[PDB]
Amino acid sequence: RAXRAHV
C-alpha cells in the first residue's frame, strides 16, 4: 500500500 513495509 505505501511501497515500504509489505514489499
What the block records as the C-alpha cell of 3 is: 511501497
Experimental method: NMR
C-alpha–C-alpha distance, residues 7 and 5, integer Å: 6
AA identity, residue 3:
X
* Amino acid residing at 1: R
